[PDB]
UniProtKB/Swiss-Prot annotation, chains A, F, G, H:
Function comment: Acts as one of several non-catalytic accessory components of the cytoplasmic dynein 1 complex that are thought to be involved in linking dynein to cargos and to adapter proteins that regulate dynein function. Cytoplasmic dynein 1 acts as a motor for the intracellular retrograde motility of vesicles and organelles along microtubules. May play a role in changing or maintaining the spatial distribution of cytoskeletal structures. In addition to its role in cytoskeleton and transport, acts as a protein-protein adapter, which inhibits and/or sequesters target proteins.
Paired cysteines (S-S): none
Family, as annotated: Belongs to the dynein light chain family.
Entry's Gene Ontology molecular function annotations: deoxyribonuclease inhibitor activity; dynein intermediate chain binding; enzyme binding; enzyme inhibitor activity; identical protein binding; nitric-oxide synthase inhibitor activity; protein-containing complex binding; scaffold protein binding
Modified residues (N6-acetyllysine): K33
Residues with PTM Phosphoserine: S85
Single GO cellular component term: kinetochore
GO biological process per UniProt: apoptotic process; DNA damage response; intraciliary retrograde transport; motile cilium assembly; negative regulation of DNA strand resection involved in replication fork processing; negative regulation of nitric oxide biosynthetic process; negative regulation of phosphorylation; positive regulation of insulin secretion involved in cellular response to glucose stimulus
Post-translational changes noted in the entry: Phosphorylation at Ser-85 promotes recruitment to DNA double-strand breaks (DSBs) by TP53BP1 and ability to inhibit MRE11. Phosphorylation at Ser-85 appears to control the dimer-monomer transition. According to PubMed:15193260, it is phosphorylated at Ser-85 by PAK1, however, according to PubMed:18650427, the DYNLL1 dimer is not accessible for PAK1 and the phosphorylation could not be demonstrated in vitro.
From Swiss-Prot, chain B:
Main subcellular localisation: Golgi
PANTHER family: CYTOPLASMIC DYNEIN 2 LIGHT INTERMEDIATE CHAIN 1 (PTHR13236:SF0), DYNEIN 2 LIGHT INTERMEDIATE CHAIN, ISOFORM 2 (PTHR13236)
Role: Acts as one of several non-catalytic accessory components of the cytoplasmic dynein 2 complex (dynein-2 complex), a motor protein complex that drives the movement of cargos along microtubules within cilia and flagella in concert with the intraflagellar transport (IFT) system, facilitating the assembly of these organelles. Involved in the regulation of ciliary length.
Pfam families, A to Z: DLIC
Family: Belongs to the dynein light intermediate chain family.
Organism expressing this protein natively: Homo sapiens (Human)
Protein name per Swiss-Prot or TrEMBL: Cytoplasmic dynein 2 light intermediate chain 1
Keyword Signal attributed: no
GO CC terms of this entry: apical part of cell; axoneme; centrosome; ciliary basal body; ciliary tip; ciliary transition zone; cilium; cytoplasm
From Swiss-Prot, chain E:
Disease as annotated in the protein's UniProt record: Short-rib thoracic dysplasia 8 with or without polydactyly: A form of short-rib thoracic dysplasia, a group of autosomal recessive ciliopathies that are characterized by a constricted thoracic cage, short ribs, shortened tubular bones, and a 'trident' appearance of the acetabular roof. Polydactyly is variably present. Non-skeletal involvement can include cleft lip/palate as well as anomalies of major organs such as the brain, eye, heart, kidneys, liver, pancreas, intestines, and genitalia.
Primary gene name: DYNC2I1
Name of the protein described by the UniProt record: Cytoplasmic dynein 2 intermediate chain 1
Shown residues within the full chain: 526 to 582 of 1066
Domain of life: Eukaryota
Localization per record: Cell projection, Cilium; Cytoplasm, Cytoskeleton, Microtubule organizing center, Centrosome
Protein's organism: Homo sapiens
Assembly information from the UniProt record: Intermediate chain of the cytoplasmic dynein complex 2, a multisubunit complex, composed at least of eleven different proteins. The cytoplasmic dynein 2 complex consists of two catalytic heavy chains (HCs) and a number of non-catalytic subunits presented by intermediate chains (ICs), light intermediate chains (LICs) and light chains (LCs).
Family: Belongs to the dynein light intermediate chain family.
Tissue expression summary: Expressed in chondrocytes (at protein level).
Function: Acts as one of several non-catalytic accessory components of the cytoplasmic dynein 2 complex (dynein-2 complex), a motor protein complex that drives the movement of cargos along microtubules within cilia and flagella in concert with the intraflagellar transport (IFT) system. DYNC2I1 plays a major role in retrograde ciliary protein trafficking in cilia and flagella. Also requires to maintain a functional transition zone.
Length: 86, 310, 96, 96, 52, 86, 86, 86
C-alpha cells in the first residue's frame, strides 16, 4: 500500500489527507465500493460536499473537477481518483 | 354428494384466466432470414442462429415482480417453402386458435425472391387457420363468431369498414430483418419496396416496424401479440412521410396515404421486378446393395404394417 | 424503520409551533436505530449462505438492500439535517 | 390429456367443507349416501397408477397418488370433527 | 438541488467453491503358484464333507 | 459487444444513447481514458454538461449524481459508469 | 466414456459443450495437463477468456469463479473442473 | 512434508511463505478441499485476492496467472498449485 501521487491540483494539506484517508480505507475495506465510500464520506465531512471517489485496478476516466480539488494516486497497485465536482 | 359438486364447480369455474393460460406464436419467415437471431435475442438467449428450420420448438419465461408466476411462452417457427402444410398444420388446432397468433419477418436481403416466398407461406398458413375454426365440427361455434368479429373490427378503428379486402381471422405483426442492406438499394427500389411492405400491412391489418438497437418497438410489439409479454400496444405515429424508418400502426394505413387494391399492387409489383440423383444408377455392387435392399424393404414394410393412425 | 423514520424526520427541521412536540420523536429515533440498524449486517452474514444454496436466486434481497442504502444514507442525511436545522432554528427563533 | 385427468378425476383445489357438512348433513339417510360415496372415492384413489409410460416420456405420478389419498382421508376426519360439535352444541343451546 | 448518492462494483459477485474427489478403495491380497488348495487369503460347521 | 444494464435512474432515451455512445466509443478506441472521453463528450453536447464517464474492467466507485442521470452497464466484459453531476 | 455431471453453475449449452470438449481431449490425450490444456483453450476461443481447467483422479480444490461459468463432472473415473475467473 | 519446488514465478519471500503455509495446512487439515481452502484464504488476506489453490496426489492443470504470482511444488507426495488470477 505504498503511496505514490501521480497528478494533483490540490493543496498539500488536502493531498496528504487524501493519501492517509485512502490508506485507512484500503486497510479496513476489501471491496472497492466500500473503500471509495469511506474516502468520499470523510471529504464531504471535512472539506464540504460534493466529493466523488473511484478506486480500482483497471479503468480510464474523463471527468470535470473544481480547481484545487483533484488528486490521482496509487496505493500499491490500486489507483484512487478523488475530486470535488458539484 | 354436494361436497363434490362444490369442489368440482370451483376447480372448473376458475383456471382459464401463477399465470393465466399462456399463448403461443408461430413465426412465418424464410430460410436463414435472420429470424432465428431476432427470436433468440427476444427470448434473452445467447445461442447462435440456425439457418435451417424443421418445425422448431423453443420457449421462454418472464416474471411480474410481485412474484415469479413462471409466465411461459411457447414458440414455433419454420422458414422457406419447405413441408409447409405438413408442418404448419401440426401445432395449430382450432381448439387453441384463440391463443394463437402469427408474426411475419421479412428478410430484406432479396425482396425479389422474398415476395413469392412470403406469399406462398402466408397463403398456406392463412388457409389453415381459416379452416380449423369449424373443420373440427365445432358445433358450439360461438367462439368462432367471436374470433372473426373481434379481429375484423380491430384494425378499422376509424376508417369506414367498407369491405374485408382480405379476410384474415388471426392477429399479425410484420417486421423486417437485416435492414442494414436496405440502404444499399436504389432509391426508386427502396420506395417501391416500402410501398410493398405497407401494402401487405393493410391487407392483413398488421403493424410494421423497423429493426435496430434503439428501436425497442420491435421487441415490444412481438410481446404485444405474444400475450402482452413485453408491454402493451404503445401506439406510435406512422412514418409514411419520412420513408427513412419503416413503421405503421395498423388502422392508419389507408391505401390513399401509403400508396398515394389490384391497381396499387400492379404498380409496385411490375415496377420492382417482373422476372420473378439419389438413384446412383451408373454404379455397381453386389453384396452391399443387395443387403441394403433387403434390409431397407424389411424395415419399411414392418413400419407400414404397424397401421399407425397418425 | 428507516422508511417511517424518514417520513417523520422530514418535518422536524422546520420551526413550526404546530409540531413543538416532534423533538421527542427525534431523540427516540436516534436512540432506537443503534438496535435496529445491525439487522442489515446480520442479513448479509446469513446471505453468505443463501447466495450459494439458492443458486443466486436472491433478487428480493438485492432489491431491498439497494432500497436500504438509499433510506439509510437519505435517512441519516435527514437526521443530520433535522438536528442541525432544529439546533439552528432554535437558536434563530428563540433569539427572534 | 392424462395431465388433466389427474386434476379432473380427483379435485385438487378441495375448498373447505366444514360449513357445508355442519349446515346440511348428518341425518341418518343423507349421511349414509355421502359417506359411502366417500369410502368409494378412497377405493378409487388407491388405484391411481404411480406412473404413466408412453412412447417417449415417463411421468412419475406416485406423489399424486399420495396427495389424493390424503385428501380423501381428510374429509372423513373433518366429518368426524363436525359431528362431535353439532351434538355438543344443540343441547347447550336448548338448555339455555 | 435534487441529487442522489450511488455506487458501482465491477466485481458484483465472487462465488467460491470447494471440490473434493472421492477415495480409491484398495486391498492387500496374497497369491502363490505352488501351494495348497487355497492359494491366498485376505490379511467350523464342516458341512463340506457331508456330500461325500 | 452485448449491452447489459445493471442500474439506471435515467430516461429510456438517455439509456439508449448511453449504450449507443459507449458502443461507438468501444469500437473506435482501445484505451479506456479515450473511450470514456468519447462517451462523456457526446452527452455534454446532446444533454448539456456536466457529465462524467469511467470505463474499465476493474473498478468500484462511489459518486453523487443528478436525479434521472445515472446508468451502469456492461458491453461484454467492459463496465461503463455514465452520469451527470454539475 | 460415460459423462456424469455432479455440480454446475452454467448454462445447458456450455455444460454439454464442456463434456464434448473434454471427451475429445480425453480421446486425444493421455496426460492430464494436456487434456486440461485442450479443454481450456477451446473454451477461451468459444466463450471468451479466461478459463482454467483441472483434470485428475485425486485432488481437492478451493477456487473462485464467475457466476454461470462453473462445471465439475466425470468422464469415467477422471474428474474435470472447468470455470471462468478473470 | 519435505518441500520441492518444481516451477515458480514468485518472489523468494512469497515462495518460502507458500511452503510454510501449505506445510501447516497439511499438519492442520486432513482433507484436500480444506487444505486448499486454508491456503487460498491466507493469500487473499496477505497478498490480496483472487487466489486459487489445488491440492492433490493426481492431477494436471492448465491455467493463466498474473505475472510473479505462480508456484507449483510438492510436499512429500502431495502437489500444491497456488496462483493468483482475477
Amino acid at each position: 500500500r505504498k503511496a505514490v501521487i501521480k497528478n494533483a491540483d490540490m493543496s498539500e494539506e488536502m493531498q496528504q489527507d487524501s493519501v492517509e484517508c485512502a490508506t485507512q480505507a484500503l486497510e479496513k475495506y476489501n471491496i472497492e465500493k466500500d473503500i471509495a465510500a469511506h474516502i468520499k464520506k470523510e471529504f464531504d465531512k471535512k472539506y464540504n460536499p460534493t466529493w466523488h471517489c473511484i478506486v480500482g485496478r483497471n479503468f480510464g476516466s474523463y471527468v470535470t473537477h473544481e480547481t484545487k480539488h483533484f488528486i490521482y494516486f496509487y496505493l500499491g497497485q490500486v489507483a484512487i481518483l478523488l475530486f470535488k465536482s458539484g | 354428494e354436494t361436497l363434490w359438486e362444490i369442489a368440482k364447480a370451483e376447480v372448473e369455474k376458475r383456471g382459464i384466466n401463477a399465470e393465466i393460460a399462456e399463448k403461443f406464436v408461430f413465426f412465418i419467415g424464410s430460410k436463414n432470414g435472420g429470424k432465428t437471431t431476432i427470436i433468440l435475442r427476444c427470448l434473452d438467449r445467447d445461442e447462435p442462429p440456425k439457418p435451417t428450420l424443421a418445425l422448431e420448438y423453443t420457449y421462454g419465461r418472464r416474471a411480474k415482480g410481485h412474484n415469479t408466476p413462471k409466465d411461459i411462452a411457447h414458440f414455433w417457427e419454420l422458414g422457406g417453402g419447405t413441408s409447409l402444410l405438413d408442418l404448419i398444420s401440426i401445432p395449430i388446432t382450432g381448439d387453441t386458435l384463440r391463443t394463437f397468433s402469427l408474426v411475419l419477418v421479412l428478410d430484406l436481403s432479396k425482396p425479389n425472391d422474398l415476395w413469392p416466398t412470403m406469399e406462398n407461406l402466408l397463403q398456406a398458413t392463412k388457409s389453415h387457420v381459416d379452416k380449423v375454426i369449424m373443420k373440427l365440427g365445432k358445433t358450439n361455434a360461438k367462439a368462432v363468431s367471436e374470433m372473426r368479429q373481434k379481429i375484423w373490427n380491430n384494425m378499422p378503428k376509424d376508417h369506414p369498414d367498407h369491405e374485408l379486402i382480405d379476410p384474415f381471422p388471426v392477429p399479425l405483426v410484420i417486421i423486417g430483418s437485416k435492414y442494414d442492406v436496405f440502404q444499399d438499394f436504389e432509391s426508386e427500389k427502396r420506395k417501391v419496396i416500402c410501398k410493398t411492405l405497407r401494402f401487405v400491412a393493410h391487407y392483413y391489418g398488421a403493424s410494421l416496424m423497423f429493426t435496430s438497437k434503439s428501436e425497442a418497438l420491435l421487441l415490444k410489439i412481438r410481446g404485444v401479440i405474444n400475450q402482452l409479454a413485453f408491454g402493451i400496444d404503445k401506439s406510435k405515429s406512422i412514418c409514411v412521410d419520412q420513408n427513412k424508418p419503416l413503421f405503421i400502426t395498423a388502422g392508419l394505413d389507408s391505401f390513399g396515404q401509403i400508396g398515394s387494391p389490384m391497381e396499387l399492387w400492379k404498380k409496385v409489383y411490375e415496377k420492382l421486378f417482373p422476372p420473378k440423383d439419389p438413384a446412383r444408377d451408373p454404379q455397381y455392387a453386389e453384396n452391399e446393395v443387395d443387403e441394403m435392399r433387403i434390409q431397407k424393404d424389411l424395415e419399411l414394410e414392418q413400419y407400414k404394417r404397424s397401421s399407425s393412425k397418425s | 424503520f428507516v422508511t417511517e423514520a424518514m417520513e417523520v424526520l422530514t418535518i422536524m427541521p422546520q420551526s413550526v409551533e404546530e409540531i413543538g412536540d416532534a423533538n421527542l420523536q427525534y431523540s427516540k429515533l436516534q436512540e432506537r436505530k443503534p438496535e435496529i440498524l445491525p439487522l442489515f449486517q446480520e442479513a448479509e452474514d446469513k446471505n453468505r449462505l443463501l447466495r450459494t444454496v439458492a443458486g443466486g436466486g436472491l433478487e428480493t434481497i438485492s432489491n431491498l438492500k439497494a432500497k436500504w442504502d438509499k433510506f439509510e444514507l437519505x435517512x441519516x442525511x435527514x437526521x443530520x439535517x433535522x438536528x442541525x436545522x432544529x439546533x439552528x432554528x432554535x437558536x434563530x427563533x428563540x433569539x427572534x | 390429456a392424462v395431465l388433466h385427468q389427474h386434476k379432473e378425476w380427483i379435485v385438487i383445489g378441495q375448498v373447505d367443507m366444514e360449513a357445508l357438512v355442519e349446515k346440511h348433513l348428518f341425518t341418518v339417510h343423507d349421511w349414509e349416501k355421502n359417506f359411502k360415496a366417500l369410502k368409494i372415492k378412497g377405493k378409487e384413489v388407491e388405484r391411481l397408477p404411480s406412473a404413466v409410460k408412453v412412447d417417449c416420456l415417463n411421468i412419475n405420478c406416485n406423489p399424486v397418488k399420495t396427495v389424493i389419498d390424503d385428501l380423501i382421508q381428510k374429509x372423513x376426519x373433518x366429518x368426524x370433527x363436525x359431528x362431535x360439535x353439532x351434538x355438543x352444541x344443540x343441547x347447550x343451546x336448548x338448555x339455555x | 438541488k435534487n441529487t442522489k448518492q450511488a455506487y458501482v462494483q465491477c466485481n458484483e459477485d465472487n462465488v467460491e467453491r470447494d471440490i473434493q474427489t472421492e477415495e480409491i478403495e484398495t486391498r492387500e491380497v496374497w497369491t502363490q503358484h505352488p501351494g495348497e488348495s487355497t492359494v491366498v487369503s485376505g490379511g467350523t460347521s464342516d458341512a463340506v464333507v457331508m456330500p461325500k
